[PDB]
Write an enzyme that holds these catalytic residues in place. Structure first.
Site, mmCIF file in Angstrom:
data_model
loop_
_atom_site.group_PDB
_atom_site.id
_atom_site.type_symbol
_atom_site.label_atom_id
_atom_site.label_comp_id
_atom_site.label_asym_id
_atom_site.label_seq_id
_atom_site.Cartn_x
_atom_site.Cartn_y
_atom_site.Cartn_z
ATOM 1 N N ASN A 26 -5.709 4.318 -0.682
ATOM 2 C CA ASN A 26 -4.468 3.995 0.028
ATOM 3 C C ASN A 26 -3.336 4.894 -0.474
ATOM 4 O O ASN A 26 -3.400 5.408 -1.591
ATOM 5 C CB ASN A 26 -4.076 2.532 -0.201
ATOM 6 C CG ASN A 26 -4.612 1.614 0.867
ATOM 7 O OD1 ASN A 26 -4.476 1.887 2.061
ATOM 8 N ND2 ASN A 26 -5.215 0.507 0.446
ATOM 9 N N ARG A 64 -12.297 -9.384 8.921
ATOM 10 C CA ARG A 64 -11.503 -10.566 8.623
ATOM 11 C C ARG A 64 -11.168 -11.303 9.911
ATOM 12 O O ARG A 64 -11.331 -12.525 10.012
ATOM 13 C CB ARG A 64 -10.238 -10.139 7.880
ATOM 14 C CG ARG A 64 -10.550 -9.641 6.484
ATOM 15 C CD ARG A 64 -9.518 -8.684 5.931
ATOM 16 N NE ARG A 64 -9.788 -8.450 4.514
ATOM 17 C CZ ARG A 64 -9.175 -7.545 3.757
ATOM 18 N NH1 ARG A 64 -8.239 -6.751 4.261
ATOM 19 N NH2 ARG A 64 -9.507 -7.437 2.480
ATOM 20 N N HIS A 75 -3.308 0.959 8.515
ATOM 21 C CA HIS A 75 -3.818 -0.072 7.617
ATOM 22 C C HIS A 75 -2.654 -0.562 6.759
ATOM 23 O O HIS A 75 -2.411 -0.050 5.671
ATOM 24 C CB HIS A 75 -4.952 0.479 6.736
ATOM 25 C CG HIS A 75 -5.659 -0.570 5.933
ATOM 26 N ND1 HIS A 75 -6.189 -1.710 6.501
ATOM 27 C CD2 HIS A 75 -5.893 -0.671 4.601
ATOM 28 C CE1 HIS A 75 -6.713 -2.470 5.556
ATOM 29 N NE2 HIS A 75 -6.545 -1.863 4.394
ATOM 30 N N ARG A 91 0.798 -1.221 0.000
ATOM 31 C CA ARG A 91 0.000 0.000 0.000
ATOM 32 C C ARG A 91 0.836 1.280 0.000
ATOM 33 O O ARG A 91 0.416 2.308 -0.537
ATOM 34 C CB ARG A 91 -0.930 0.012 1.215
ATOM 35 C CG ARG A 91 -1.829 -1.209 1.343
ATOM 36 C CD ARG A 91 -2.714 -1.094 2.587
ATOM 37 N NE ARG A 91 -3.610 -2.238 2.767
ATOM 38 C CZ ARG A 91 -3.234 -3.433 3.218
ATOM 39 N NH1 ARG A 91 -1.966 -3.663 3.532
ATOM 40 N NH2 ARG A 91 -4.130 -4.403 3.358
HETATM 41 N N1 LIG Z 1 -8.947 1.299 3.101
HETATM 42 C C1 LIG Z 1 -9.105 0.066 2.683
HETATM 43 O O1 LIG Z 1 -9.259 -0.870 3.433
HETATM 44 C C2 LIG Z 1 -9.103 -0.258 1.202
HETATM 45 C C3 LIG Z 1 -9.657 -1.530 0.724
HETATM 46 C C4 LIG Z 1 -9.633 -1.775 -0.681
HETATM 47 C C5 LIG Z 1 -9.093 -0.811 -1.590
HETATM 48 N N2 LIG Z 1 -8.576 0.405 -1.040
HETATM 49 C C6 LIG Z 1 -8.032 1.384 -2.004
HETATM 50 O O2 LIG Z 1 -9.227 1.945 -2.615
HETATM 51 C C7 LIG Z 1 -8.841 2.535 -3.870
HETATM 52 C C8 LIG Z 1 -9.870 2.201 -4.914
HETATM 53 O O3 LIG Z 1 -9.948 0.745 -5.076
HETATM 54 P P1 LIG Z 1 -10.818 0.181 -6.273
HETATM 55 O O4 LIG Z 1 -10.825 -1.288 -6.186
HETATM 56 O O5 LIG Z 1 -12.147 0.850 -6.377
HETATM 57 O O6 LIG Z 1 -9.993 0.649 -7.536
HETATM 58 P P2 LIG Z 1 -10.380 0.854 -9.043
HETATM 59 O O7 LIG Z 1 -9.101 0.957 -9.842
HETATM 60 O O8 LIG Z 1 -11.324 -0.142 -9.423
HETATM 61 O O9 LIG Z 1 -11.128 2.261 -9.048
HETATM 62 C C9 LIG Z 1 -10.389 3.455 -8.723
HETATM 63 C C10 LIG Z 1 -11.123 4.501 -9.608
HETATM 64 O O10 LIG Z 1 -10.497 5.812 -9.284
HETATM 65 C C11 LIG Z 1 -10.642 6.633 -10.410
HETATM 66 N N3 LIG Z 1 -9.794 7.817 -10.370
HETATM 67 C C12 LIG Z 1 -8.435 7.992 -10.558
HETATM 68 N N4 LIG Z 1 -8.026 9.239 -10.441
HETATM 69 C C13 LIG Z 1 -9.200 9.924 -10.154
HETATM 70 C C14 LIG Z 1 -9.409 11.282 -9.923
HETATM 71 N N5 LIG Z 1 -8.476 12.252 -9.929
HETATM 72 N N6 LIG Z 1 -10.737 11.688 -9.658
HETATM 73 C C15 LIG Z 1 -11.795 10.764 -9.626
HETATM 74 N N7 LIG Z 1 -11.608 9.416 -9.852
HETATM 75 C C16 LIG Z 1 -10.296 9.043 -10.112
HETATM 76 C C17 LIG Z 1 -10.183 5.670 -11.532
HETATM 77 O O11 LIG Z 1 -10.534 6.163 -12.816
HETATM 78 C C18 LIG Z 1 -10.858 4.363 -11.132
HETATM 79 O O12 LIG Z 1 -12.155 4.206 -11.711
HETATM 80 C C19 LIG Z 1 -7.392 2.004 -4.145
HETATM 81 O O13 LIG Z 1 -6.449 3.067 -3.944
HETATM 82 C C20 LIG Z 1 -7.228 0.891 -3.130
HETATM 83 O O14 LIG Z 1 -5.886 0.686 -2.764
HETATM 84 C C21 LIG Z 1 -8.578 0.678 0.335
HETATM 85 O O1 LIG Z 2 -7.119 -4.506 2.669
HETATM 86 C C1 LIG Z 2 -7.368 -4.761 1.460
HETATM 87 O O2 LIG Z 2 -7.943 -5.797 1.070
HETATM 88 C C2 LIG Z 2 -6.942 -3.757 0.405
HETATM 89 N N1 LIG Z 2 -7.085 -3.926 -0.902
HETATM 90 O O3 LIG Z 2 -6.586 -2.761 -1.525
HETATM 91 N N2 LIG Z 2 -6.143 -1.891 -0.511
HETATM 92 C C3 LIG Z 2 -6.365 -2.506 0.646
HETATM 93 O O4 LIG Z 2 -6.086 -1.994 1.867
#
Ligand SMILES: NC(=O)c1ccc[n+]([C@@H]2O[C@H](COP(=O)([O-])OP(=O)(O)OC[C@H]3O[C@@H](n4cnc5c(N)ncnc54)[C@H](O)[C@@H]3O)[C@@H](O)[C@H]2O)c1
Ligand SMILES: O=C(O)c1nonc1O
Ligand SMILES: NC(=O)c1ccc[n+]([C@@H]2O[C@H](COP(=O)([O-])OP(=O)(O)OC[C@H]3O[C@@H](n4cnc5c(N)ncnc54)[C@H](O)[C@@H]3O)[C@@H](O)[C@H]2O)c1
Ligand SMILES: NC(=O)c1ccc[n+]([C@@H]2O[C@H](COP(=O)([O-])OP(=O)(O)OC[C@H]3O[C@@H](n4cnc5c(N)ncnc54)[C@H](O)[C@@H]3O)[C@@H](O)[C@H]2O)c1
Ligand SMILES: NC(=O)c1ccc[n+]([C@@H]2O[C@H](COP(=O)([O-])OP(=O)(O)OC[C@H]3O[C@@H](n4cnc5c(N)ncnc54)[C@H](O)[C@@H]3O)[C@@H](O)[C@H]2O)c1
Ligand SMILES: O=C(O)c1nonc1O
Ligand SMILES: O=C(O)c1nonc1O
Ligand SMILES: O=C(O)c1nonc1O
Lengths: 322, 323, 323, 322
Positions: free
Chosen positions: B129, B160, B184, B97
């Site tokens: 992230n 989880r 995280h 991340r």
């Molecule tokens: N906090 C958590 O536990 C957790 C869990 C899962 C994923 N995440 C994070 O969440 C984020 C999104 O995951 P996802 O699976 O939806 O990804 P994804 O790639 O499917 O979707 C991300 C979207 O962001 C859009 N994007 C990029 N730049 C942008 C901008 N300037 N303005 C508006 N939209 C923009 C992209 O076009 C894309 O559609 C990732 O960074 C991932 O690491 C965090």
């Molecule tokens: O925790 C997860 O599964 C995760 N997937 O994308 N970013 C993350 O933090």
């Protein structure tokens, strides 16, 4: 265990398969088996979906598999196994009929797996070309006629209803709009049977709430909805509404609800059709397809319907000629 | 002449998580939805798919797409998923991340300007992230109140932890209270000592043979590695189902003022001795935003672990300022 | 510092229907609840019972009791069930909603003053009988907007019509659209011609043998007599389960601006040629209150029936002015 | 019908029986049989509840009965048959123990009906004196030990949790507070085991979110809750929370959820108890009572628990001496 949970096998764990497993988690509808030939991805979906039970505060089992013996004991089997597009073709040329040579092969494989491990299941085919594939699955599997159907018209009707709902500024819950026929360009949105809580749409039009040209436009949008989403997504096709449509059908069976959900069903005289599957209004309950609603179509409607029928008929001829 | 308007949630980012959250809003008829993204086309495909679903769900909410921030005006809640999931070039095993920092900091600051301008009164839930770092970045870039900004992460981590324990004890996850706090990432802290079965300490169940200490430890490690495992198994992107539900659960706690205890990255002002930073802590989410930040009596050992967690966010925050 | 407050529904009358509606609010976590009644003691017993239920339902809303109108201040919706269910002295067979007029007119006018003073911006749903007469009485006594006052009745009548048809056709009532309009009494009008199975006219099902015309007629009569049958069978009070759900369904349509088609007693201004009166008509309930009043193209025959229905409300309204 | 709906028999169609039937309608949990010796009233409740399915948009069957053959095939049986108060006594003197001579008779009658028509059902006794009545039903019916329990502590805990939730200004979903023991004045609200999402209440008290005197007050309120509601209602006793408590238990069985729901269960060594039923933490799933959680009570807690036990023991002695 005296009282075991319902069990649903998702044959195909792609966009729709995974989303359906998610719905089961949210509603605690049943234990889920995410089956697929691909290894890795399904276990990832299974982990994601199962982890969601904690947040949903529900408790069902979600696992993955690539061996058919894992679907044994399934009450319902929802088949999404197949390709969403022809390798190489552009989104501009997307056609459900072209998936025939690619998916028939897959559906036959699935039929053998179901026939062997869970022949008593209620089967909901999703894979395209839908109407052709349901017939293909029925013949190959040998399952009873009332235990096999194809999800399509519920989705088409959902679109029909939503468009009307937006125009009339009324909830889609109170819009009864049905599409029947082959799931494709010749699907038949029944404009004459559209009602607002039973009240004919015709009465709302006479009052200026909707124009006849707007209804026609909505009827066209309904037919083009799938391709529109394919065009806009860039990757694959619709999965949210399609997943809910199939699960709504599965639940109607599981809980013996007796819901009217248009789906591709086996025809034995209805609408003058024989030995084929096509989208028609039907009632789904614990007995599978319990009723096939035979509507009194007008001559104009019968012509449209006959063209819709020709599509599956030719599609089925191409299937046989392979 | 609408006196009673529906709630409105803007999904900044309409990827896997954004679309799934919109789907959730449809199923629960939680709120109107705006699927925002820089990409054009895809979001509208998602809006059409999700709106059409209202018919089958028999609910009625509006789901539209957008690429202009003026569309998120009036939003009661904003959930930000805008950002990259993986770094091009890196293998799945190398997934971390932290490497996402220089790609998403840029994105989060843009989103910050958009929210600041069009819906500065929203309750904001960051998902992008590196989470703890991104939430802090959004908060200072946007200028929103400290109690109206938080990051979703620990709810997912705890889910989880809970599911794993639930499987072992053969009890519904509803009755397992397992919490993860901290950053995280690999140094997140699953609070083994605070795991209960409807309030009953897990250690009593272990003492009675229901499960072993070794399994607890195996599960603690598994909780930390859960994200990467899914990243590895999917082969494309990362988890989205549980993540989307985690975020929407927090959003609902706010919208309906439920006052749920949902661990998330929150602004620190003395808790555990921390200042001017965001990090995962047990919190109470209600109509007032983050209404309570629970400070647990950690043992020295747990403190040692928690400090390593803090060291990580501090480092990331340094790397951010260094841009 | 609560930015997002929960919805608030005041139940004026905490009898069988009032308490049951509070229970519904708990289960759906629809809104905070105030159980108001002139009687002291019982309402609080209901509030305690319903609030304790939130724990098992895992929801969080506030359920309190009251006997002072200042407590209903701020209510988004007010559902009035205050009133008598039966006339002392009358046999169960003699039960008639009209005899309740001189006992409940008094009560409804008191409630009107309370709502006018403390929550004049609420969406009001009258349940008290004689319904159509009581809604009109409340509306003029309170001074609330015509689109913010309505009476629950036809949703209940239609529910019966639907359940009966559903049983005969072996189809879920969800897919049966059967509507009753007119005065809530012996002259209510179950619209046989507009009965559909997911939009498909019932007559097609009859023509195909699924059920007979004689059964349709039997069901039409049964729908009209449903209330009295339950009154006779219960031996105490009248129906409350379906009634409570009917009212809460309307309340929810308003609160979440769903725009549901729910027949209820509404203010007439030309529809079917009626003026200054309330009577059951198909309506669309949303955030704007009664957003649409559907005027169906009735045949002369149906008009004849509908006129007898109107004659009844007109008579009752006369008897009311004659007090 | 391949997939039949779950079936729950409500033996006793009064305030609680009818309300439980209503919950089934709302959740489409199962078909309902409103059984009772009284004729008329049950059919009225059955009509009311079934008519509600239309508005709920669900589909289950709700009927009434006064012949035990009507409960055949029930997956679950919830017993509320009995008196809520002693004929003649004032609400000031309400006591669950006094209902003994009146309700034992009724429970025995029900036991014979269940033993004969649906011996494979999971039974949830509600009738008071609860702990005594469950044992009475178990002996008379001959059903397996894991298929019979009494609903009580879930209700008591719901009160305990709600009171704490109000004080801490946190949702009761996140308050784990348990009451065990005999359902009466000597029920044991486990103050030491109260947690906020697993975090000991003790930590919230040390921080000034709640005082030790307030906790004590809440513990007392929990014990007096039932009588308070009896006093305030004037007619009968609580039914909303009691109905949801029992249905939550029934659902845990029906859907094999494995929920931790404190209920009066059969003891075979647990807590040093033998041949009796008493409120204890337990896990309910498709196997009935799948787990009886044995907590490490402190000496102070064991004393309180032993007094709670004495109550059922003497109650059961009075039952035998009849
Ligand atoms: N906090 C958590 O536990 C957790 C869990 C899962 C994923 N995440 C994070 O969440 C984020 C999104 O995951 P996802 O699976 O939806 O990804 P994804 O790639 O499917 O979707 C991300 C979207 O962001 C859009 N994007 C990029 N730049 C942008 C901008 N300037 N303005 C508006 N939209 C923009 C992209 O076009 C894309 O559609 C990732 O960074 C991932 O690491 C965090
Ligand atoms: O925790 C997860 O599964 C995760 N997937 O994308 N970013 C993350 O933090
Ligand atoms: N009837 C309808 O209304 C409707 C609506 C949408 C999509 N569809 C069809 O549904 C199908 C699936 O759509 P999707 O979006 O989930 O696609 P997807 O590509 O995401 O998933 C399809 C999955 O099928 C799996 N698969 C391939 N061969 C298999 C085999 N032999 N056994 C088991 N699994 C196999 C693939 O590995 C893939 O994961 C497509 O054919 C699409 O055209 C129908
Ligand atoms: N519209 C419909 O379809 C429909 C359906 C069922 C019942 N109803 C009517 O609903 C009303 C309530 O039915 P119920 O079963 O709840 O009756 P109920 O007797 O159980 O409760 C009525 C409550 O009104 C209270 N009350 C009396 N005067 C009051 C006043 N001035 N202010 C506040 N509260 C007051 C009483 O104390 C009592 O608790 C009856 O008049 C009944 O005829 C209408
Ligand atoms: N365990 C708990 O927490 C708890 C909570 C509330 C009430 N209760 C008990 O639940 C019981 C029912 O309470 P209620 O409010 O529903 O009472 P109620 O009086 O409303 O209903 C009891 C019903 O039992 C029926 N009945 C009597 N003898 C019968 C027989 N032989 N067969 C079938 N039905 C018979 C009566 O006709 C009556 O309708 C009471 O004994 C009460 O003390 C227990
Ligand atoms: O109709 C659709 O949306 C569709 N998407 O993929 N196949 C289909 O039939
Ligand atoms: O319709 C009913 O059931 C009714 N019960 O009391 N008043 C009524 O209108
Ligand atoms: O505990 C209660 O509320 C109760 N009410 O009636 N019997 C009981 O046990």
């Amino acid at each position: 265990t005296v009282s075991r949970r319902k069990k649903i096998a998702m044959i195909g764990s792609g966009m729709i398969g995974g989303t359906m497993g998610y719905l089961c988690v949210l509603r605690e509808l049943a234990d889920v088996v995410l089956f697929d030939v691909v290894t890795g991805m399904p276990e990832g979906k299974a982990l994601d979906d199962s982890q969601a039970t904690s947040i949903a505060d529900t408790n069902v089992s979600v696992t993955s598999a690539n061996q058919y013996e894992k679907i044994a004991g399934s009450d319902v089997v929802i088949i999404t196994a197949g390709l969403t597009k022809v390798p190489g073709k552009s989104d501009k040329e997307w056609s459900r009929n072209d998936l025939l040579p690619f998916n028939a092969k897959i559906i036959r494989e699935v039929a053998q797996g179901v026939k062997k491990y869970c022949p008593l299941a209620f089967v909901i085919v999703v894979t395209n070309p839908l109407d052709c594939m349901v017939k293909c699955f029925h013949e190959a599997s040998g399952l009873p006629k009332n235990m096999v159907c194809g999800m399509a018209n519920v989705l088409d009707s959902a679109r029909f209803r939503r468009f009307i709902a937006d125009q009339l500024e009324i909830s889609p819950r109170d819009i009864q709009a049905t599409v029947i026929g082959t799931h494709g360009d010749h699907m038949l949105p029944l404009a004459r049977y559209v009602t607002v809580n039973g009240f004919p749409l015709r009465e709302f039009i006479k009052k200026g709430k909707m124009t006849e040209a707007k209804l026609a436009e909505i009827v066209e949008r309904t037919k083009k909805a799938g391709g529109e989403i394919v065009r806009l997504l860039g990757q694959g096709s619709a999965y949210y509404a399609p997943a809910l449509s199939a699960i709504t059908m599965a639940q109607a069976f599981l809980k013996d609800e007796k819901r009217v959900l248009p789906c591709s069903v086996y025809c034995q005289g209805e609408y003058g059709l024989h030995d084929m599957f096509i989208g028609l209004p039907a009632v789904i309950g614990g007995g599978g397809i319990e009723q096939v609603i035979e509507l009194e179509l007008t001559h104009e409607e019968q012509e449209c319907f006959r063209k819709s029928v020709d599509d599956v008929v030719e599609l089925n001829k191409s299937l046989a000629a392979l």
